[PDB]
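Narrative progress, year one. The postdoctoral researcher (J.K.) led the effort to move from monomer predictions toward full complexes, under supervision of the PI. The following entry was the first complex the group processed end to end, covering 561 residues in total.
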Amino acid sequence: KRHRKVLRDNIQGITKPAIRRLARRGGVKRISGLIYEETRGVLKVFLENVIRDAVTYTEHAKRKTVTAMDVVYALKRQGRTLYGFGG
Amino acid sequence: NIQGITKPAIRRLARRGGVKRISGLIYEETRGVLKVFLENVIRDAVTYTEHAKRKTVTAMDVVYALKRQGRTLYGFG
Amino acid sequence: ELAGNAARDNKKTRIIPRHLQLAIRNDEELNKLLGRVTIAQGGVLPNIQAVLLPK
Amino acid sequence: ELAGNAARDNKKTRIIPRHLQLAIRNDEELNKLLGRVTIAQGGVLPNIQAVLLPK
Amino acid sequence: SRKESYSIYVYKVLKQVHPDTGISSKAMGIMNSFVNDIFERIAGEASRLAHYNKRSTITSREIQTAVRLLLPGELAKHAVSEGTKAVTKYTS
Amino acid sequence: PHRYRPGTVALREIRRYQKSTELLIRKLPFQRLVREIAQDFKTDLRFQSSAVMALQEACEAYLVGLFEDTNLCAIHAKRVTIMPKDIQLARRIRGE
Amino acid sequence: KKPHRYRPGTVALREIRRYQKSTELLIRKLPFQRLVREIAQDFKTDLRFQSSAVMALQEACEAYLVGLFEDTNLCAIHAKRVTIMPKDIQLARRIRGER
DNA sequence: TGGCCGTTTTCGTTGTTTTTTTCTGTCTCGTGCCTGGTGTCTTGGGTGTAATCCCCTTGGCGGTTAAAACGCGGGGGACAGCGCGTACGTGCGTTTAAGCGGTGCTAGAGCTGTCTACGACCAATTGAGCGGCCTCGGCACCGGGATTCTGAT
DNA sequence: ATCAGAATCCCGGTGCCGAGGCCGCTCAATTGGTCGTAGACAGCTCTAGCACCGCTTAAACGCACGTACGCGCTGTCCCCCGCGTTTTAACCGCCAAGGGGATTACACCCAAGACACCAGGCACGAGACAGAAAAAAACAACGAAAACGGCCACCA
């Protein structure tokens, strides 16, 4: 009965150097200034779809805690099977 | 027999795809791609035929093969 | 519903496969649902990239 | 088998997920079979496009 | 709280192929995920095969055909060889 | 004599072939190719007619989609002519 | 004497090698968690999350983005450029079939 | 001989790799146990097999015509080179919050017991849906005039 | 702007064949009843998710600065389009055969179900060593700069 500070503008936590590092893993050598906002949008869309499905599973089980298995099933049914989080 | 897929036919297909100008080397490349695609589908199709211990490939065999590669086809059920 | 509309635009009284393909591809949510479905004798949507037109 | 080979190439005696990812991506048929699978803590194969290296 | 996994069998196979090699807990978990994944794919494909031909029993024949559908080329041939040899040795 | 400029007839053909739906490859050579390829897996196979028509619908739809993506790749590089490297890029990104 | 200063690109390449050699997650844990909770709140209020669920989500997100950047880089190189731009991302996602 | 450019080397450095030392936790082995896997017997129905039939696939003949193949002129598009400017890479000082460690607490995950509503199953019923037959109108193809549109002038 | 020619649109006519309707029938959906069981609900435990505080420090951030890259422009040339002509084989129709797919009937063996049992596999504990971390170090690389070498200009 002591809830956290209302979440706002959290998209800004995806920092410029973090996206740069991810791009480095992808082999990108030079990065236009406009890339960052685009990346943020894409990421947000992806996340929305995943979290939507996960929460749907959570509600079907009449639980209030999203579990790792919920996420694994959501990802699996979108053709992005994830290994390592079973059991 | 690969040459029966003629140059003007591929041109017509490209027209449906919206292509306005076509390099001369495209045609041979396209043929190769087509061959690969066909092989895969047919490989699966004949497998279904063989599982049923039949000698005639049916339309349903093809539909199932296509479905399991994620290219669902409507109209032949 | 959508296929009937497309048929009426084409001044045809019978829905044919062409009208079904037009109906499905012109509706964002149906197109999403049937993104990986091929309608035999459906053709494609009329669509020319702007850069290809003259001037 | 492939993961053990990779482990010895890296002079490690215990197979870890990195070795599994390396093993999977370096074998064409396994890579085909697991084309849509993410190996947690796997990383990617070292790979730099030739055009990016200096002349 | 009893949770089954393939861990002990994975470990025995590992000792067959690399006597002096170990494995981390995470990797064993990944192996369990892998085994379950391939299991589900094969069983599901076999179910579809049985359904298409109006047979109510899944036999080793359905398993073999499913194996040919899912695995590419030489991997498929080798797996089929192993399965056939295993079934024939078992039958005697 | 009258002569249309390069591209006008191409555009006319684009409109023509996007308006209609008839199959664009000749039936018989396509069938011959199918039988030849089939022959390398199992001898003496026959085919139902509707199976071959289904295969033809699938092949042409697949190729049409590939050409749309190829065209987008060509235009991206500020060209208007599609080239083999465009096809290879499209196929790599699709994951084949 | 002049301070030592590598030419543009050297350090980028060294970073590519560095980050392709290792496997640790590259986004900060807590801001990512806050992002997830904010997005989740717009479907149902007061949800809680298991820790391993968030870690799984993070693995999925970063793997997805890494793949997107590989394809983006290939699209950029195709146009004889070396700098990736928004139109490259949009082409990559159009060809994948997400849009 | 003077100048300029290519190169080589050299020295500084610095970030990466390699070698050594402490630890530790994470992994390999032992133990006890119990329940899930194995042996046995039973039935029955699903699958294998045999005969038949017919329909529907393959092969051939012929024509004929539309489409494929080929030649050629040209134009416009691919492509290479060049200049520039600006956006982006690199480095440095600052700061902010990420992370870790501790402490609290309570919602809800998780397990158990009970029981009632509900679904499997079964017999009788019947009417909805399917196979078959018939017909007419929407559509398609033909032809001909009207209108549009494109390119050279 | 013009105009000619090619293409398209429209309007009407004829036909034709597939859509729509009708009728017999049959079996699949319906109803009523029975019985086992599964999941709905209550209730209890205790895990772990959340909240907070404090300290640290590494990452983020803003800015200065220099330059490599995107982009626009220009010239060139090549190869694809468009159009006319020749050829060929796709297509349509028509027929023949046989083979294989569908059907029905019979049989039997193989698997579900039940029971009885027991050993392998699975929590818990322990110890010990591979690897993580830290540190030193080697060291390989990058690249400024400079030192050398080589190349050219003039005319002698």
